[model samples]
Every structure is written in C-alpha cells, then in structure tokens.
Target: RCYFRTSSKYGCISNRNLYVFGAVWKTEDCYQCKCKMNAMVCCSLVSIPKNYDRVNCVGLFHKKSCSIRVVKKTDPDISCKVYN
Candidate 1:
C-alpha cells in the first residue's frame, strides 16, 4: 500500500494508492486501472473523471452536523456532508 493525495473542496488529502493494472500504480484518485494475466500482471493506466458531483467537495465542516450518504457506491464520494 502506498500514499497519494486527492483534492476536495477544502484541499488535498492523503489516500491509499491503487494498483492501476495490478502492478501499475494509480497516481490519481479518480481514474481507471487496467489489469492483465488473470490478475497476474497488469499495466496501461488511464484517467477518469475526478469531478466532485456535489457537496462542494469541501471538507467536513462540522462532524456533529455532517453525515454521509451513499448515492451509489459503498463509500460517500464527498469530503463532507452538511445538515441544517
């Protein structure tokens, strides 16, 4: 596991580097990875949309008032969730 930085509304944060193609490292947070050899060897990295759909991408303003909701994927794509 390696370390990488991703951008949010607030700023950049540390993230676990992903293996683009099993061996090739994914330098960015939002991108696609290509694998080969039935998961034995992999390479050929590509870039995907890293745009934050909503939440202004700003970091969690107030943890007490902020909560996360998953629209599709398992994890919340936004850095923070605001509630009033």
Candidate 2:
C-alpha cells in the first residue's frame, strides 16, 4: 500500500499517512502482490467555499468543525442543524 500526507487544516492528523485501500484487499493474499493499485496517491486538493459553486465538479464535500463530510451533491445555500 502507498502512503500520503494531508494538512491538519484539512482534517489530517500529524505523523499519520493516509492509505486508500480496496474492499477486496481484506485477505492477506490480496495484499501479497504488493500492488500499488490498492493504495492511491491523493495529490489534488481543493478547499470548500473556494470551489463550492463550481459549474461542474467531479467531487464534492462539506466542511464543519474541522471535519469533512463527503456528499454526492450539495445545495448553494446550506443551513446548520442547529443555529447559533
């Protein structure tokens, strides 16, 4: 598996390398090949609000309390579950 680092501001913790693995790689034999396909490198980073309303976005998410919530789709105007 491959390793990658993300910034803390983007919900990433220090000293930890994020790994992207496939569902089928559960058994030891699956990972025996040591293929890099199971582990993907995340080089692209786009902050929310900056690209919130992009005409055509390939991926989307919502950020709150320093955490990210990935959503299939989002609305222009969002309301918090609880208002301050």
Candidate 3:
C-alpha cells in the first residue's frame, strides 16, 4: 500500500483477494475489512471472551458463527457461560 498510484487504478488486497479502493467486504475467515487508497484495514468480527471462569473453563472464538464458545476443561462438551 506504499507506492505512487492513482485512485481509479488502486485497490486493496488481503489473502490474495482484491477489493476496490473504497470498497468494504467481509472475509471468509471472519474479518471485517475496509479497502483504502493507501492501506487495507481488517479486524476480527469475533472477539476473545475477556471475563469467564478462568479456573475451570476456557473460551474459544469460532469463525463460522462469529462468536465465542466457552467450555469446561474437564468436560469439553459442556458449555460454560461467560460474561463480556
């Protein structure tokens, strides 16, 4: 994104996918992207759980649902409720 270029001829690229200069799109890998003239900005749609049962549970972010899943360590099949 660092070069001499024109707006009509410029675009953004991420993971080999191309986007227009001012275009916005969602990625298959669960990212929200904004195509810019000089740079491409991308962010995660799914965020890590910040508050949860740290001692007995863990949080995992899933791309398909764009959400976090908390599970118990001893029984991974069991769901754990997480806050925030």
Candidate 4:
C-alpha cells in the first residue's frame, strides 16, 4: 500500500481520480489496475471475494479485462501482478 509521486499525466479510474499516472504505487492487484498508454495504473489491494465470471471495471475509466495485451492475471491468491 505505497505510492510514488511523479510529474506526468492524470488518469481516471472507475470515474475517480485514483491513478493520475502522476503518482504510482509500489504494487497492486489486477482488479485495481488499468492499462494507460505504455504504463499501467495500479491501486492498493483490498479484501474482496473472487468471481472470475464478473469483472469490475467502473465507468469509462479502467474498464478492461485481464490479458497479455492488457494485463495478466496470476493465481487467485496472488491476483493480478503490478504493471510498473
């Protein structure tokens, strides 16, 4: 649950100013991440149930499933690995 600050661009995840691409996190889960240009936006991991059938990508931001082109989902225990 750590973040690194930067001076770049801003991004919207789940319709919220979660990941601005300006600040980055140390590590995160796939469900709390999104594909943004050459980099990926990752948020802190939280306690949640697993349901592969249902993917939660709020609003217009960060709305994509896990895949090689986008992201790779590891074991459910590990969730999705960080991008940056």
Per lDDT, the best of the predicted structures is 3
lDDT of 4 at 67: 29
Please report how far candidate 4 places residue 22 from its true position, in Å. 17
Question: Tens-digit lDDT track for model 1 on 1-84?
Answer: 222333333333224433333344333332333433333222223222234445334332223323333232234353333343
lDDT of 3 by residue, 1-84 (tens): 123223334576555666787787666877777777767777777777778888999876776788778999999889898776
Worst 10 residues of 2 by lDDT: 26-35
Per-residue lDDT of candidate 4, residues 23-78 (tens digit):
43343344355445445655654433233323422112232332222222332333
Lowest lDDT sum, 10 consecutive residues, model 3, at 1-10
Task: Give the winner by TM-score.
Answer: 3
Q: How far is candidate 4 from the true structure (C-alpha RMSD, Å)?
A: 13.9
lDDT of each: 0.33, 0.31, 0.72, 0.38
Query: Residue 60's C-alpha lDDT in candidate 2?
Result: 32
Those runs of model 3 whose alpha carbons end farther than 4 Å from true positions after fitting are 1-9, 54-62, 71-81
Residue 62 of model 4 has an lDDT of: 38
Per-candidate RMSD, Å:
15.2, 14.3, 5.2, 13.9
Instruction: Please say which candidate is ahead in TM-score: 1 or 4.
Output: 4
